[PDB]
Enzyme design. Structure first.
Site, short mmCIF file in Angstrom:
data_model
loop_
_atom_site.label_atom_id
_atom_site.label_comp_id
_atom_site.label_asym_id
_atom_site.label_seq_id
_atom_site.Cartn_x
_atom_site.Cartn_y
_atom_site.Cartn_z
N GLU B 186 0.83 -1.20 0.00
CA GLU B 186 0.00 0.00 0.00
C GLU B 186 0.86 1.25 0.00
O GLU B 186 2.02 1.22 0.41
CB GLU B 186 -0.91 -0.01 1.23
CG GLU B 186 -1.97 1.07 1.23
CD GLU B 186 -2.92 0.96 2.41
OE1 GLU B 186 -4.08 0.56 2.21
OE2 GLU B 186 -2.49 1.28 3.54
N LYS B 187 0.30 2.37 -0.47
CA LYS B 187 1.03 3.62 -0.48
C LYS B 187 1.21 4.16 0.93
O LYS B 187 0.28 4.14 1.74
CB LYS B 187 0.32 4.67 -1.34
CG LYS B 187 1.19 5.89 -1.62
CD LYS B 187 0.56 6.83 -2.64
CE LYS B 187 1.53 7.94 -3.02
NZ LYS B 187 2.83 7.43 -3.56
N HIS B 194 -6.02 11.72 10.76
CA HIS B 194 -7.02 10.67 10.95
C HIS B 194 -8.41 11.28 10.94
O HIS B 194 -8.78 12.03 11.84
CB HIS B 194 -6.77 9.92 12.26
CG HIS B 194 -7.80 8.88 12.57
ND1 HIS B 194 -7.52 7.54 12.61
CD2 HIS B 194 -9.12 9.00 12.84
CE1 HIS B 194 -8.62 6.86 12.90
NE2 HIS B 194 -9.61 7.73 13.04
N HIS B 221 -0.64 4.87 18.45
CA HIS B 221 -1.86 4.57 17.70
C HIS B 221 -3.10 4.53 18.60
O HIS B 221 -4.14 4.00 18.21
CB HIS B 221 -1.72 3.24 16.95
CG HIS B 221 -0.54 3.20 16.02
ND1 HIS B 221 -0.56 2.51 14.83
CD2 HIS B 221 0.69 3.75 16.11
CE1 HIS B 221 0.61 2.64 14.22
NE2 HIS B 221 1.38 3.39 14.98
N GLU B 261 -12.96 4.76 9.05
CA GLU B 261 -11.76 5.53 9.35
C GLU B 261 -10.91 5.71 8.09
O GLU B 261 -10.64 4.75 7.37
CB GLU B 261 -10.92 4.82 10.42
CG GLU B 261 -11.60 4.77 11.80
CD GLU B 261 -10.71 4.16 12.88
OE1 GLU B 261 -9.89 3.28 12.56
OE2 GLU B 261 -10.85 4.55 14.05
N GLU B 273 -9.79 1.39 7.66
CA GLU B 273 -10.51 0.47 8.52
C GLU B 273 -11.93 0.93 8.83
O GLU B 273 -12.20 2.12 8.91
CB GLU B 273 -9.76 0.29 9.84
CG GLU B 273 -10.31 -0.83 10.72
CD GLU B 273 -9.39 -1.18 11.87
OE1 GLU B 273 -8.22 -0.74 11.87
OE2 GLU B 273 -9.83 -1.91 12.79
N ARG B 277 -18.80 -0.98 15.26
CA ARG B 277 -19.25 -0.83 16.63
C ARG B 277 -19.34 0.64 16.95
O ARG B 277 -18.91 1.48 16.15
CB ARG B 277 -18.24 -1.47 17.59
CG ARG B 277 -16.81 -1.04 17.29
CD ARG B 277 -15.86 -1.33 18.44
NE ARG B 277 -14.48 -0.98 18.11
CZ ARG B 277 -13.91 0.20 18.35
NH1 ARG B 277 -14.59 1.18 18.92
NH2 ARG B 277 -12.65 0.40 18.00
N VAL B 280 -15.38 5.05 21.15
CA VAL B 280 -15.16 5.83 22.36
C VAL B 280 -15.56 7.29 22.15
O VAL B 280 -16.27 7.88 22.96
CB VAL B 280 -13.66 5.79 22.80
CG1 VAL B 280 -13.40 6.74 23.95
CG2 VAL B 280 -13.24 4.36 23.19
N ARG B 323 -9.68 12.29 26.52
CA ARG B 323 -9.73 11.04 27.25
C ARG B 323 -8.88 11.16 28.49
O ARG B 323 -7.65 11.23 28.40
CB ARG B 323 -9.21 9.88 26.41
CG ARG B 323 -10.02 9.58 25.16
CD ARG B 323 -9.55 8.29 24.51
NE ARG B 323 -10.09 8.14 23.17
CZ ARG B 323 -10.17 6.98 22.52
NH1 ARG B 323 -9.75 5.86 23.09
NH2 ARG B 323 -10.69 6.94 21.29
N1 LIG Z 1 -0.83 3.75 4.29
C1 LIG Z 1 -0.54 4.39 5.53
N2 LIG Z 1 0.03 5.59 5.56
C2 LIG Z 1 0.32 6.21 6.72
N3 LIG Z 1 0.03 5.62 7.90
C3 LIG Z 1 -0.55 4.40 7.94
C4 LIG Z 1 -0.86 3.74 6.73
N4 LIG Z 1 -1.42 2.58 7.05
C5 LIG Z 1 -1.49 2.46 8.37
N5 LIG Z 1 -0.97 3.55 8.94
C6 LIG Z 1 -0.87 3.80 10.33
O1 LIG Z 1 -1.11 2.55 11.10
C7 LIG Z 1 -2.25 2.88 11.97
C8 LIG Z 1 -3.18 1.74 12.09
O2 LIG Z 1 -2.48 0.56 12.38
P1 LIG Z 1 -3.27 -0.78 12.61
O3 LIG Z 1 -3.44 -1.51 11.29
O4 LIG Z 1 -2.51 -1.68 13.57
O5 LIG Z 1 -4.67 -0.45 13.22
P2 LIG Z 1 -4.80 -0.10 14.73
O6 LIG Z 1 -5.11 -1.35 15.50
O7 LIG Z 1 -3.45 0.46 15.23
C9 LIG Z 1 -6.11 1.17 14.98
P3 LIG Z 1 -7.54 0.50 15.89
O8 LIG Z 1 -7.49 1.02 17.37
O9 LIG Z 1 -8.87 0.99 15.21
O10 LIG Z 1 -7.50 -1.01 15.90
C10 LIG Z 1 -2.91 4.01 11.35
O11 LIG Z 1 -3.57 4.82 12.33
C11 LIG Z 1 -1.88 4.74 10.71
O12 LIG Z 1 -1.32 5.71 11.62
#
Ligand SMILES: Nc1ncnc2c1ncn2[C@@H]1O[C@H](COP(=O)(O)OP(=O)(O)CP(=O)(O)O)[C@@H](O)[C@H]1O
Ligand SMILES: Nc1ncnc2c1ncn2[C@@H]1O[C@H](COP(=O)(O)OP(=O)(O)CP(=O)(O)O)[C@@H](O)[C@H]1O
Lengths: 431, 431
Positions: B186-187, B194, B221, B261, B273, B277, B280, B323
């Protein structure tokens, strides 16, 4: 503009005013008595100044001391809150005469609306509907008084111009009028609701009306529960009476926040008083209009225009307020003392305006109001259910409160229906 | 319809759900571990049932025990809140298979959006914009991988389909992909914010989008501060992405509340994603739309239509949420213990969502979030100033909190400007 404000009040409204100042970056000067040293807002204020001993007469009604505090701090303005000196024309007159901005209307306008017939006089001229009356002081010749009385229609009611006796038959007029600093005659309404219009007026010649509130739930003429908008009142009627009040503001040269109180019966409004100040129950209007009334008070005193036009104001949803007092819920005997545990409710559409905190002692020296619980909902029903729930979560341990009374009012089938009159509460309590 | 709901969660969201139920006259069943016996919502629930010992694995993730509680009470539905079992497809599948209504989407739709490429797959079909990628699993032949990578443009990022490694140059591809249950390409966006769209969908085939939230302030994150609407986003762009998300709901057969998101960069949205649900930070959306999201969740599970149409939704004003966690504001070490004194803020535009009360002990067994402070203002600035003031009034004695961190964030000149990216907080902390 306004750089520093002296908060000439106490309790919840002092805190309300402090919050409004903080948000505007205005410096706060908390004037307090010796018994109010531990008030939440005093503890948050930028500067504090003891203005006297506990009794109100010696502190919060102490005009020389309050102005002296404004002086030694370099304040630009004084916010009187409600009660105390807020409608004392001598105070506002004396405050301006010493070069401070009085956050409220000018002394002349306070004098004007402070005398009852002089008030009804202005409203009549302005187009504001008044109760059919003698329209002026009562003569002492009854042969003629009976004409006015029969003209307007028994029952009538004799009223002090600077304050009441009800007359049901012609035979008891002569005498009823004798019993008392003058008195006028007026139509007596048996089934009225208390409905009041909020207004704002600035020094740019603008005036807006902010819908209405219904404050019919009262004990000994003291408001207990308020709501907005007033049930049964349509947008059309709102515009009518609202625009009349706005016009009256301009006609009399009003400035700042104010409220026109009416008796509402059979679709008719009848003016009885203008409160030339912020009111306790102003929050319910804020919830349904999105207007910050105290911030507008400050902007207006600063010489600014009202920050919105009439067209910008739309009523949305419904709001309720319960005045939570430290008192026995049946006898209404004040209940001063230490709050050993406080738990305030929260969540969506719940607002809590209070200076009380766990460990705080409610003093005996002043009124009994310790908190205002305010709820908002998309409908009147939601607001009520929201209030009921918030009340049940609320803990105030150490003292008695009137919460049980509110819970009684809220589950009342007639109150649920809406439109109960100004006599209903005392009647329910009696029963 | 829904007569009794089992609240399969804890802390603030359990209380949020309880409040929503109470307002709808729905009976509540609080399932709790032994360590949560004194939770505020447990103490308010109509029925309580201990489902296990303190550890989450033995209580709140105990599927057999949670369903047994729904059984022995005769519940009609189970609300999973967020976290724990809310996106566990086995749980939702098992819950329906036993005849209870699962307050959320169906198991199939959870499985669908729970796998990353399978998710990006659906969005693409539905018209929801995704990050330029391999669009599917990565081959292991690099000669071709380099094409996709060069096609979309370095930097690229390798991502686990059920979860990350960033690649800046072509020379390190072959290997970066080897390092791990599959992975796509992915790019990689260097400066993204966000931004997430709230949606609701009912069983009458309706779907609405409720504006967006910006949750760019994060540590590891994990969201720290959120706001709505997202600065810089116009009503026009809102309609575009919003309507695409609403359509996607119908295409995939979504039901209940959910959030899409996105990463937002240079005016482009890129899906990453869907949280299937409640979230928060849902309260900030409630403040700007007047929608009660949890009440809609309940209505929708009851088989009712969303209680409003898309046209009824207008963004008004601005909202912020902090929070508040029981943790050291610098090390972020949890700080469990007794809250000796709680004072929660109040006033106009201040909302407090918390299960904490004076005398309550914050347990070690679960997450550190103890309260959500939410403010609303007619503008973004007012909301921020309101948050700053509310925070300074807030007392939580006995434990450490991250309040000092929030105060740092709120007075940050860049945050005040708006639009800081997802990397900004960790960067400020570092500096
Ligand atoms: N293509 C992209 N470019 C820049 N950042 C990216 C990216 N893909 C993912 N990220 C970063 O990874 C984070 C998400 O990582 P992950 O896949 O583990 O979900 P997560 O579990 O951390 C969020 P959640 O709490 O909803 O589960 C994103 O918030 C983003 O900051
Ligand atoms: N013409 C009328 N018909 C029916 N009730 C009337 C009335 N005139 C006055 N009242 C009653 O008398 C009350 C007001 O009395 P009063 O003149 O003493 O003002 P007040 O001091 O009690 C109210 P405030 O707190 O604003 O000062 C009204 O609320 C109303 O219930």
């Amino acid at each position: 503009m306004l750089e520093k404000v002296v908060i000439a009040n106490r309790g919840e409204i002092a805190l309300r005013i402090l919050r409004a100042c903080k948000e505007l970056g205005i410096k706060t000067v908390a004037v307090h008595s010796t018994a109010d040293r531990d008030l939440k807002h005093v503890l948050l204020a930028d500067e504090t100044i003891c203005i006297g001993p506990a009794p109100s007469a010696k502190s919060y009604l102490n005009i020389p001391a309050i102005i002296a505090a404004a002086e030694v701090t370099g304040a630009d303005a004084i916010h009187p809150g409600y009660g105390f000196l807020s409608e004392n024309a001598d105070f506002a007159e004396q405050v301006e005469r010493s070069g401070f901005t009085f956050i409220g209307p000018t002394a002349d306008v306070i004098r004007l609306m402070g005398d009852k017939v002089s008030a009804i006089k202005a409203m009549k001229k302005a187009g504001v509907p008044c109760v059919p009356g003698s329209d002026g002081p009562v003569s002492n010749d009854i042969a003629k008084n009976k004409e006015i009385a029969k003209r307007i229609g028994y029952p009538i009611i004799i009223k002090a111009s600077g304050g009441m006796r009800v007359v049901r038959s012609e035979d008891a007029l002569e005498e009823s009028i004798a019993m008392t600093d003058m008195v006028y005659m007026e139509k007596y309404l048996e089934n009225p609701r208390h409905v009041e219009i909020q207004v704002l007026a600035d020094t740019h010649g603008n005036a807006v009306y902010l819908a209405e509130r219904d404050c019919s739930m009262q004990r000994r003429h003291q408001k207990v529960v308020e709501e907005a908008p007033a049930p049964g009142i349509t947008e059309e009627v709102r515009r009518d009476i609202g625009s009349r009040c706005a016009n009256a503001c301009v006609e009399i040269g009003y400035r700042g926040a104010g409220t026109f109180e009416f008796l509402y019966e059979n679709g008719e409004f009848y003016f009885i008083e203008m409160n030339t100040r912020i009111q306790v129950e102003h929050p319910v209007t804020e919830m349904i209009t999105g207007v910050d009334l105290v911030k507008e008070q400050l902007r207006i005193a600063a010489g600014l225009p009202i920050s919105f036009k009439q067209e910008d104001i739309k009523v949305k949803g419904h709001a309720m307020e319960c005045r939570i007092n430290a008192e026995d819920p049946k006898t209404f005997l004040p209940s001063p003392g230490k709050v050993n545990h406080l738990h305030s409710p929260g969540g969506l559409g719940v607002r809590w305006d209070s200076h009380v905190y766990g460990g705080y002692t409610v003093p005996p020296h002043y009124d009994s109001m310790i908190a205002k619980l305010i709820t908002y909902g998309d409908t009147r029903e939601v607001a009520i259910r929201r209030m009921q729930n918030a009340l049940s979560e609320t803990i105030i341990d150490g003292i008695k409160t009137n919460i049980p009374l509110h819970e009684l009012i809220l589950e009342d089938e007639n109150f649920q229906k809406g439109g109960t009159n100004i006599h209903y509460l005392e009647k329910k309590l009696g029963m």
